[PDB]
Symmetry: D3
Subunit: 340 residues, 6 copies
């Protein structure tokens, strides 16, 4: 429901983006070419003109799965078997060149590149595709490792998972929900900056709360970390309301903030929630998703040079469609930045 | 929904009768707190407790009259340093604390503070429970409680919150006290939370929460797996499992589909957290977004009934907390008699 | 002896006469303290300060009449939460402390406490100095001072004591604040102690104390040797030496006979200690054992004049402390005029 | 004052008599030390010990003749590597040290050093005690003693000093060995200190010193509070208390007024320190500026009588130390008589 | 020496003839490895094992025909995911690892990897041993072995190498697995090495290596000294000694002359190293610049026979490794039957 | 092998002949060492050095005559405390060490030790080099050298050994001094070793050794990879590479076959080790079992020529070390020639 208004606006922005670009739709690689949930989601995704899907796998292995489920319009969609691809040898040498001083010999560089996750990441890095969506079948750290060492982070960026909580008026952004165990104050500032750019993309004023178990205490440990993170972010972005350390209800509820901490620079409630450690971010978004009545979409991987998202291992068919939509949007956004 | 609260009110009444009809004496240090006084208006209607307010009687009565709350006339009001037992209370605090850096003059100043006086009242049986912390931060409110009442043997002070869903309630712990509990401490927190769930006639099913599903890797995955193992040792009759993610823990479908080897079936109703950031942020986010009622936090592990309100609380929040403080006071008074 | 304190009292009078007969206003948070009130009887005759007592005017007068001390009939008495500036002080403390875990209601309770009200009075110029801590432990008395008045730039809060010998006085530091100062902190403590000694027209000679004589081994010998080196670079005109034992430091014959290469001749009169255990135990043992007067401790490194009495103090100790707090208030009020 | 010292001198005399009139054989590794020789002049009149001087006989005798001390002209003189027991001593040290990085040639060189030969003489019963360290730093003097004589079981090596006041004496420890004793070690130091006090017929009253009064806060307050608890369980008949400040410990009026719950009444006469900086600085400052005699340091916890003089000692101090070393040798020679 | 290897080959034949002529079933995960196939040409004439190659059948067959190795035309070839036991193996691996972050689908991919399938074949008795790692790094080849076969009681996985000199052979351990073994672990490594030496009818004489000779100083000297002590208590019939330098260890004349108290006479033939850098570099340097043949490494401490070749191995190395893998497989079959 | 040393002997003769007819004065602290004296018989025949033996002249002479070494009846013999420069040497050591815990009496006693006297002779130009340590452990022999002669600018003290194979020679470092050098220190060791290889007109090719091949993992793999990077930036003309395994380092085929991206080709001839266990064990193992001549260790990084023999050395070992000590002394006298 609230997804459906939010995702439909996102789907429209993908269409506005393809149009005024000749009608080019982003090429997205799916390493799990035989995944039932990926293929069923792709039925929706070509119907809706979101992307050209490129599936990885043994072609007949893939096609006979499609006809078993008989979802018709994946009729002609691209299928690539990594080690049969003409660029396989060039991909192997590039991964070897990247990793030969990280304990990776030519044979394992060959074995890694035959794995669809590495092949997909190299395809995106080398411009054979605009994005990838992986991790339907494997755990997050394994799915994200090929992405970080092949595609990597942009300058001063930090890889950080991000989730949207979709409310009646507003949405909230939560980060970092998937990658960093215990980010420093500097890293928390960088995660907040990345989260704010995403909020701005939707034409919304980002209002950033650095979360703690404390309200404006600044005591040793995380209160001080989250207080310092707010300060660093404010110096790197003096136009944004950024505040901390504060408790979560203090952060989201504007009447709580005004009544208890009127000196605070964050008014109107936070829509960006930065967490102090992975336990808190990862448990929070999952508890909201399971017991709250709010739809949470994501996680989405911020901080990487090209568009690449890891599906949470628990996702539904609706999740995958949402994730591809935002992978397409990100690929289009990255493709316009790259020219100017 | 309010059904869980109405059942608790009914139990408080069921408890009074079969004890002559006496109601637990609940002392409130913040005698002039607007939210506390508004909550008690509701709570005297329901015959939950005999409230004792602390403060200067005239200052308290003028506040009650300013708010136009007629039902609090004649409610007991006590000024700590004018009470007959003050000096005896000062002497007991001094004896508890004179080797913790507290001289007699400092013991006198502390006992004139309503939070210490209330905690001493509960400790000495002059009251059956206390509710504080509407106006001061949690650490300041809980220090007199821990220094005066203390924890029972093998207990650990740990805040606990109820999440009330349509079918079902969850308990969250530890939401207020321990920064980074060890595996041994998380196990003790689980047992404490499990006993509370049992009190309501529900089978406790305990999950040790992590950002990981059954990895046992270094750090909190290993800690929460070890916590589950220790918990299983001391109570082999309970479903206790970890390390696992929160959606795995509460959703019986995710568990059976992805981790069928797990000893926890049917979804967890006890969620033990690995550190204070995760526990504290979670219940406040659940409370603010999503439409589930969250009650608490309640201080477990302490020798007598004493609960600290979150500073962000509403008036209904306070009413809920007093109802369960009265239940806890009635239960602890049965234990104290058996002993 | 009596010469040093009487010379100090005279220096307060020279400063007062040179400012139109003004006396420094000194706040005493412990307005009902028996030892504070008895000490003030001595000090009101000598016209060293205008005392301001904090408390409920009646219980303070009730106690003055119990102790049957007539020259305090006219002493000013202030109840913090009744004072006209109370709410502005509360707002000021709230503003400085609202991101240090202090809400407005807690700022109100702290400012009603005499110790915080005294520190704010000194900070805000309603008084020139304060003296506290006869009745509470040192950490509790000094916290409002450090949180409200604070340290001057690059300064460090450090307790200092004078040991009064027939010839000479010694200065001991840091006797009260820092558990385990670094080499950098020990040099800064030496610098603060050195300026106090110069104020009395004495040449400072600084020893960085250890359990070792010029070994420079790992742990405190190396720390005190590095502290001496840091201090010498920040003050190349002063004799500063370490690491050395306490008898080596104070006895010039031991130094010359055993360590002739040393840059410290004639015996040290500034003794900087390696940790709080050694400083605090030393001045207290000296004070109790052997007959040297020990005065202090005096809180150095802070922006305005504020000293905390040791809880074990006598009535004469308080008298000595008020005298030197008055001199400090006068000195800081001359610096502020620039 | 000196009443305490001749009381000890007389106790040595009553001890030699009723035993055969023999005097304890005390070896001095520093046979050519000016301060040692001048001190021994005083001590042979008083018939305190047979000194055995170590060194080359000719070198030692010309020093005695240079200083014009006629009364040392038939003191025994021993050259380690010429002594009949040298080779057997080398091999006992070699067998003990051959897995601690010491080959046979190095055992020969160590045993030719007077400090090691003296420790071996005392260990092997060729002498009753030793006194060393007038000329070298304490750690170098005490290493042969600890490696050769060692500690008795559950003992800990700890320096101890007597502070002699008009009415009473104080005992201070650990003044020389342990940098940062644990609570367990501090309790053991207290037990050793208490028995030394009992030898003089005095009731030991033990204070564990800190910069805090009965706070138990983290770090040394908790350590010294725990040390008192361990000590009280190991000797429930003694007043042992802590953590407390030094003036609290020694002054009975301060203790009673501020801390009446304390189990220590009448003032402490045994002061156990939390670290070596505080102990070492304290006894040295008292000795130099306090106006009481300080004797020691004396090495406790070791199987036989062996004491290391402080490098800063006077001739007079060396005399005091030898007297109590003689008493200790006599006491240990009665215990060995099992 | 090829003299030593030929004795091993004959011992395999004696073991086979004494078990009905059965030869050990040895799995090779690297079924297409050129060096492995070339080695197997040699190993099928010596009748050492029945080889089982893992891989897809024509890839393995196409490779055999490419290299034109006629004797491997009928060697068994197994494609893991087509094997009838595959799903049973997955369920067993899943049950072992499902609380180590391995879901069922991941257990499926792992079991399709030949290294895991080979390890599970050995674990479940479908083969008697395995040889892997010609093509992948050591830690990747050994992880499936450690996770699947595991270590026996109180065992520790540790690589062991034979250095074959004219007179004697030396054993080196741990050459591949443990970065920084504790004294407890180093003693276990010695015990494991000693049993292997006994198997060849030789008396093991064990040296715990260090950069120090019988010093026992902090760090590695103390570690190797305690390791010698632990091993001696766990095996009082063996000469075990340390800490010592490598030339001291191997040269009996150096031992006799410089450390005659040592319990090791005749030179050590078991050399235990203090960390992985020293063990790994030593055996590789001996192999390259000495003129002694070095065989191994062989994985000790594990429940069944599984050896990982060093990636740098030659074809002769693999032949040497399979011979001793065959011997170990035959030995482990007698233990399993008794 | 005999070629490399004879070439070294001849280069000594050309440098001396180019320098009048003088040969370096080499002082030997161990004047009665049997192995030192037997080696000196060989070396004065070879007209390598002007030897100075330290000790009591009669004790040394009867050792020489007892062993019947006729060519030594005219070698210089010096008793340190009888030498004219003794007291000036004591004063120079006192100045160097008086803030490191060494009093004047300790400086006199240390300077009577031949190891300290020899080091002071080399420092003060009374000799051109020294050779010590045949009879005492390495750390005791090298301490006087480091405390007296010291390290040159940005240098690090590091032991170095030559391994002589038929084709070439390898250099190993640091074999004697640093327990666990940082990445920065390993680079400095590489630079020092590289200069020594250059001195013989050979191209230095440097391997930073690990138990890993180009992994860069945490611990020594990352340390040796970073060390190679630091060394390459300070010396961009040299092949410097790591982290790598030892067989990878020396064998150029293994390198080319398995790691062709590597910048070190033709095999390493400079091997820098990650820790003292690995360097020290490797050179001693090679020396005993590798059937290669190993020369050293030689002390690099020090201002003047001073080498410590390993205690396990042979007579031929000593002869080799003295030859290269002479070459080093001659070379250091051309550098001082600016």
């Amino acid at each position: 429901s609230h997804s459906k208004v939010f995702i439909r606006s996102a789907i429209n922005r993908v269409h506005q983006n393809s149009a005024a670009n000749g009608g080019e739709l982003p090429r997205i690689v799916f390493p799990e070419g035989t995944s039932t949930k990926v293929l069923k989601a792709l039925a929706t995704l070509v119907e809706e003109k979101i992307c050209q899907p490129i599936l990885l796998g043994y072609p007949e292995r893939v096609k006979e799965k499609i006809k078993a489920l008989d979802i018709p319009l994946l009729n002609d969609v691209s299928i690539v078997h990594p080690s049969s691809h003409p660029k396989y040898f060039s991909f192997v040498e590039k991964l070897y060149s990247l990793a030969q001083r990280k304990g990776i010999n030519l044979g394992e560089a060959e074995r890694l590149m035959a794995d669809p996750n590495y092949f997909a990441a190299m395809m995106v890095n080398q411009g054979e595709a605009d994005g990838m969506v992986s991790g339907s079948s494997i755990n997050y750290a394994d799915a994200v490792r090929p992405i970080l060492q092949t595609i990597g982070v942009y300058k001063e960026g930090i890889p950080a998972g991000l989730n949207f909580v979709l409310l009646e008026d507003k949405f909230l952004v939560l980060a970092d929900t998937t990658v960093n165990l215990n980010p420093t104050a500097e890293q928390c500032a960088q995660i907040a900056l990345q989260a704010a750019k995403i909020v701005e993309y939707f034409g919304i004023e980002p209002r950033v709360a650095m979360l703690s178990y404390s309200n404006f205490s600044g005591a040793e440990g995380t209160p001080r970390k989250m207080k310092k993170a707010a300060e660093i972010a404010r110096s790197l972005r003096p136009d944004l309301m950024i505040e901390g350390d504060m408790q979560a209800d203090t952060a989201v509820n504007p009447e709580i903030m005004e009544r208890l901490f009127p000196f605070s620079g964050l008014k109107g409630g936070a829509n960006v929630l930065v967490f102090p450690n992975l336990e808190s971010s990862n448990i929070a978004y999952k508890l909201i998703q399971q017991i709250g009545k709010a739809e949470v979409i994501g996680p989405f991987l911020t901080g990487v040079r090209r568009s690449a998202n890891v599906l949470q291992r628990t996702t539904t068919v609706d999740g995958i469609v949402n994730s591809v939509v935002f992978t397409a949007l990100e690929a289009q956004y990255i493709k316009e930045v790259l020219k100017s």
